Amino acid sequence: QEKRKQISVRGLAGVENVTELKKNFNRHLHFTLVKDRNVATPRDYYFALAHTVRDHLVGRWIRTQQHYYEKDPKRIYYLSLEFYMGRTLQNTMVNLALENACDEATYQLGLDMEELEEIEEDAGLGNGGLGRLAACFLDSMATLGLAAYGYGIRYEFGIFNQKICGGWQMEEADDWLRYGNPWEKARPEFTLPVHFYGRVEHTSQGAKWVDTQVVLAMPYDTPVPGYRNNVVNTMRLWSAKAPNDFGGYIQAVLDRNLAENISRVLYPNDNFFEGKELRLKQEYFVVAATLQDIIRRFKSSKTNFDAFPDKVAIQLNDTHPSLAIPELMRVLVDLERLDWDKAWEVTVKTCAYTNHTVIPEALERWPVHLLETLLPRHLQIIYEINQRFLNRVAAAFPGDVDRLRRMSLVEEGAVKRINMAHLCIAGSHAVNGVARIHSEILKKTIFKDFYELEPHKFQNKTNGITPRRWLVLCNPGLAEIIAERIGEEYISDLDQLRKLLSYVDDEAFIRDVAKVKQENKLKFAAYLEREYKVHINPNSLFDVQVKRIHEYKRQLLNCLHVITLYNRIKKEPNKFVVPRTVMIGGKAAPGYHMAKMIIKLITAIGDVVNHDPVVGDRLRVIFLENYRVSLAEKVIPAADLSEQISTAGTEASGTGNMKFMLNGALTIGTMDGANVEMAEEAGEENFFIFGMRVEDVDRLDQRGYNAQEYYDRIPELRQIIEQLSSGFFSPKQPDLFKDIVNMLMHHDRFKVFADYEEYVKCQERVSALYKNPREWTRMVIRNIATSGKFSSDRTIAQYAREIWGVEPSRQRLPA
Template identity: 40%
Template sequence: MTMTVNEFKEEMKQRLKEKYAMDFKDASPQEVFHVLGSVVKAYYSDAWSDTWKDYLRAEQKQVYYFSIEFLPGKMLKSNLLNLGILEVVKEGLAELDFDLEDLVDVEKDMALGNGGLGRLASCFMDSIASCGLPGNGNGIRYDYGLFKQRFVDGYQVELPDEWLRNGNTWEVRKESKAVDVRFGGQVWMKEMADGKLKPVYENDRILRAVPYDTAILGYQNHIVNTLRLWSVEIPASQEDQYRSIDDRRQFEDLTAVLYPDDSNEHGRRVRLAQEYFFVSAGVQSIMRYFKKLNKPLTLLNEYVAIHINDTHPALCIPEMMRILMDDYELSWEVAVSITTKVMSYTNHTIMAEALEKWPVELMKDALPRMYQIIEELDRRFVATYSGVWDADLIQRTRIIQNGQVHMAHMAIIYSHSTNGVAKLHSDLLKEVVLHDFYVLFPERFNNKTNGIAQRRWSQLANPEMAEVLDETIGKSWRQDSDDLKLLKNYVEDEAVLTKLAVAKQHNKQKLASYIKEHTGIEVSPEAIFDVQIKRLHAYKRQLLNLLHIMKCYFDLKDNPQKEGNQRVFIFGAKAAPSYTYAKAIIKVINECANLINHDPDINGRIKIVFLENYNVTLAEQIIPAADVSEQISLASKEASGTSNMKLMLNGAVTIATLDGANVEIRDVVGDDNIVIFGMTEAEVYACYESNDYSAMKIYEESPILQRILNAFVDGTVPNIQYEGQAVVDSLLKYNDEYFLLRDFASYVAAQEQIDRLYSDKKRWQQMSLLNIANAGRFSSDDTVMRYAEDIWQIEPVEKYTKKRT
């Protein structure tokens, strides 16, 4: 859109008077933020309405992306950027004596996700709109999200994340679009006069799902899609069923927090109810839209694609079956055919134990109609393939086994596409984890390597780098990230290398100031900023990082004059509340930090900084300042990773195992511009096959490892008597499930290579430049276009004119 600074200022002044009856000199940043939000919404409201009307008028096929997590981060600057008015607003606010960054600080991160899964979903929403594709998100409007992380005496403490305390400027409540969702009770099938069976519900409870819509703006293309999030309410007709405080608390819990603690029966019940709640509400909403088209139900797949992001929304399948059979009276055969054509599924895990399963008795009790349909889906699958395929194969792949409902099995069998999220991941799904299903349905399996919304992670997170790129290669890269490759022409240009290095240094200075303000720890921007930011999980191997840090510490204790670069090791991670071992690792890292950061012998040569409450906004601070990107999961365990892509885009050099998308990063930057270490996935599986790995043997043969692990239990590192023992036991007593000790020596050698490379300033700057130049390969714009063409079969709206190669 086009708008002058003066037009913007006049609009702001008028809105401030209307909303608060005051002038700017009397307004607080909070008040100005809300006024600015209403102005921005007014700017895109026509486009939002026009986009919806265009889809309806053109009867375009739309994709509905179902995800239990969305992690969009703050939306103010993103919306301004996508509207094309970021600089105008910045200048206008400055003339009104307000700094845009102060208003950005007012906005809360939308607490709708945990990590990569939710951030990927949000990147996809951004790219679907920016590519002009007709698409919608469908999820849950959590009251508190995951949790706000605080460290108390080194321990993780979980506090409610009250992100909605002052409302959400960007959402619009759509009361008229609310739907009812049934839970519990009993369901029996009654034969009608025409011989058809109709479900009869008894003693069930009905909850009202009310949608809150958030506009998702395409990048300067007048396309505005919708992220629909559902909140739970009690229908007026059901008030009598919720008289007690406990009854009301149970229903309120449904959309209170992301991932309720599933270590107990109540938590599991709430989590299953959550999954059905947003699935049922979303599918009902889709079918209500489809009715407006007046098309035969048998053509549903020509107008609707439903994407199941991980297994949490897998109940889309039986819920669609329920609606088609119970509400529209279609036969089972027709309903299952339609459902399979509409559904597609993304698998996000290599670890079979992480594939979601629900106890049959819980499913029967909480969702009786869903269980009836799932049971029949399973029975018919077995009946269809028995005699065609090996009986053992059918038993291994059926949906209901050993008293559990296997959600991934249902998602694969009753959808038309199953994709992995990196080439290695997809290959392992076909060859190992889901091999039986690949035998049955080879044509359904495909790869779609993850991507990131590069506008946020470059233009917004790193404006100084973006300016250097503009000066060097022009601005086309802002529209088409593939043009970043033009930067390769400047790998020998000292002036460009220096400009990028200066931008990096300024980002490091800003992060150092943030660290000082929020932790009291002083770090030198001249040090290597070595960054590991991701969920705290044993397979991601934050502990391997710590083992190396402790080696560096002991090396300096023995020889304070030892040569080498200063290091700042930066962690950002949350552990699931019930994940005791991960929380123990957090405690150990924090106590090692206390020891090392305050040891006068070290003299600041090493610092450890574990930043609290890692989220999108914090990532936007850390990533532009990173020199080293830690991607050190055990090969074969990480599906893809996306922090690796964000850090690469911002010029960090990756130290990595050949896991997930690291393999593809290596392929595009070349062996000389990434540092690879550790076992390969083939070696990991060979180790499983031989079953002869002995962590104790490695420990006994390594004085270095003995010193490090002993330090966790002999008092060298204070205040970790219990947690240190838990860590040591995991490695020695329980034989090091993720092969940290096996990869330790290789990792140390790789870190020594990092140190040597960083000492050669020009070589390091060239590596950094080449990582930026090759990062366009991992744009989520390109990823969603592949989904659109290969899986969803949707096309950009006609007026969308962005050229793609």
């Protein structure tokens, strides 16, 4: 399209720049891909453009790292088992101001750049929110000029590709590297050894970890460009490699695969702890290789370790890299020969821990037997940490023996375990939650004892999302009508969106906000037709719930609402209702039986609703297959209504909520996580808040949740449960949904029925406002305008000043 080339936020198509891009495109097609235009496929053209764009990062990448060596600022190490990066081509072009020049260059070559973008695989190296947070954070730390390094694992296979077959999830390997990764640089020269198993021998200089099995950690470095500041930071992802030296010779060569399995695949659990030894190996693999880099970099700066916390921050993304704490003590005590107490002073000042859930089944509690086998020196260090930590509890709270038992890093039971959250709190100078309500729940419930011992350690860092990927990239139409009014500074200063409240009565802005949403809906509707032969009504309200399938997120509450709408149509067919396309998408963890049953129920509801001729185009229910970062970038800008309906107290923050608010959907939600702060920023009058508050959930927990009461008092609810039970949604297998019905009626930890009536009434209010396009749009303006707090630049600026002790800067490096 010649229309999108007119988008000012996409930069200049400089005549010389366009000439150079076409030359470098053709150059890579010949020398890099070894093709000519006679045999070249769209995939070859995507790769030729990716190599051409990647060449523009290299000078800035080298100069940034040289700049950090020269200036020696404090270095931030962001340790995560997940980096949910998504694609890279568009993000690179946006951050380097190349997007219009590449669009023009490709257009002149006879190519559609948008079609080339759709060839790139997502770097799907995460599960959901925590993984994407790490990705938004790398982007914001580069935009804020921080000497920041993402450290993780280069999984051969990311989050599984979800297919829907027979209305059921099927999992397939995410072979994201099949056609290579043009962004990464392999660094085999910087390969480091990681040790497993073995035994401790305590001798003449102290402890020595011996008889270990070695796994090599080969780093792959990916550029992380800041927004037009010429900063390019690094994401370093470790790949597992068998050691050089060693069933016979052949079997021994094949058995190299066992060590190399450590980086093979991402564990697909979202908010659920699976205590697999292989997962523990992945956690130690990242920590051990990463801390070797950190220590070497420290020593090669302007050994004495007193300055180490002035030169190093380690941020732990969940407890996944919690072993950083005992590993740093092991390195400082066993190898550097520091006194325990000095090493401990260093460790706590270096390390900080971010918590992302209060759900007990999500928290890591490793069996002591497994730690003793795999990491014997780490277990000895953990026990020593626990004794000295509990000595401090005993001195602060003398004779509080129950507090000692509650706070211990060691959990007693049939299987003795290490509580990794307790280890993180003991070994960290800062502990944060990820939304105001969540950080308050930590201090009141799960970490109350720790908060009482060291109140100064407990912080809030409300989550955010990068307005590069999540507005300029995915919704250039909206970014453009905003820039037409307030210029471009908001792209790295999102609080300037508040200027848009001046436009609530501006006829042109009201027109343009609605026209951009409609354009996004028409494009998404086209996609569903072209890639899946699925028809959707583009004059319908796009009602979207996209996130991992989890009982706490209550896709089932959405299911009850959808069936309510269906049943209300059947009872009063002649009565006008606002047409809806209800879209639900997300992956279930492969072992999660209830999650997989919930996907089948969504598709089953579709099978009835979407073929009832009385309903026709008034209601459609579609399960969006393979929800991932690239699909988020398509559906979120097309959404009218953002479903954020977690049981109050269960969603720590959410970030999908923020994406929807930034892209011109209105929110229906509970007072949970960051929904509370989004409502506060916009005004509650501009949010569809419903249901129990945290205090109400607790009152139910105090008297006991009886789902039967709701069933007995609510005829419309009774009708739906009877439909599920009797087989209305599974006629060939009438008892198919018995496990969902049994859970809802007798074992529902998330109180789905308790929010049913307020949810349905709230949804009526949504439909009422949608009937008034002008007032729907004015309320959208009030949401976009107040979305500025939810920039990850705001979040990271708080991490930098309140935890890391570094001052962010938006100032550009030279050219």
